[PDB]
Design a protein around this ligand. Structure first.
Ligand SMILES: CC(=O)Nc1cccc(-c2ccc3c(c2)[C@H](NC(=O)OC(C)C)C[C@H](C)N3C(C)=O)c1
Length: 127
């Protein structure tokens, strides 16, 4: 089995905007998570071919990862901050679907999620 194509990251057919919340999501939330010790398995799509995981995309039908999120923010792909927050949540939930609770990668994801949740509690005001 092949990997699926990665998620879309740009779309000229959607209107674009910059907002305080979107800027915060890139400059604070994504930046902080990206630099974390345990970021790296989450910094690009799961390469199921390289990892020899033929069942990964048999269950995970909405893949998401921080590399995709980073590009989406850079490309003004999201109009509303909650679209981006949803993508982070999807990334965490995928990890907790495919992987057994307590396993190494799950512990890594939970540490990242903790930091994510702290940063989201400090989201700036809406326009
Ligand atoms: C040495 C090595 O593991 N090099 C490597 C290279 C690139 C990506 C990944 C990589 C990418 C994604 C994931 C995993 C590994 C996890 N398997 C695993 O040993 O995780 C360790 C980091 C505890 C499996 C799981 C499918 N996963 C996620 C995020 O749900 C791994």
């Amino acid at each position: 089995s092949m990997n699926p194509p990665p998620p879309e990251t740009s779309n000229p057919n959607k209107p674009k905007r910059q907002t305080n919340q979107l800027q915060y999501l890139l400059r604070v939330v994504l930046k902080t998570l990206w630099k974390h010790q345990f970021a790296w398995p989450f910094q690009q799509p799961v390469d199921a071919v390289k990892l020899n995981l033929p069942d990964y995309y048999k269950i995970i039908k909405t893949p998401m990862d921080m590399g995709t999120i980073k590009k989406r923010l850079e490309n003004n792909y999201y109009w509303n901050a909650q679209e981006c927050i949803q993508d982070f949540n999807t990334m965490f939930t995928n990890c907790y679907i495919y992987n057994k609770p307590g396993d190494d990668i799950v512990l890594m994801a939970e540490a990242l999620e903790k930091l994510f949740l702290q940063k989201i509690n400090e989201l700036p005001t809406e326009e």
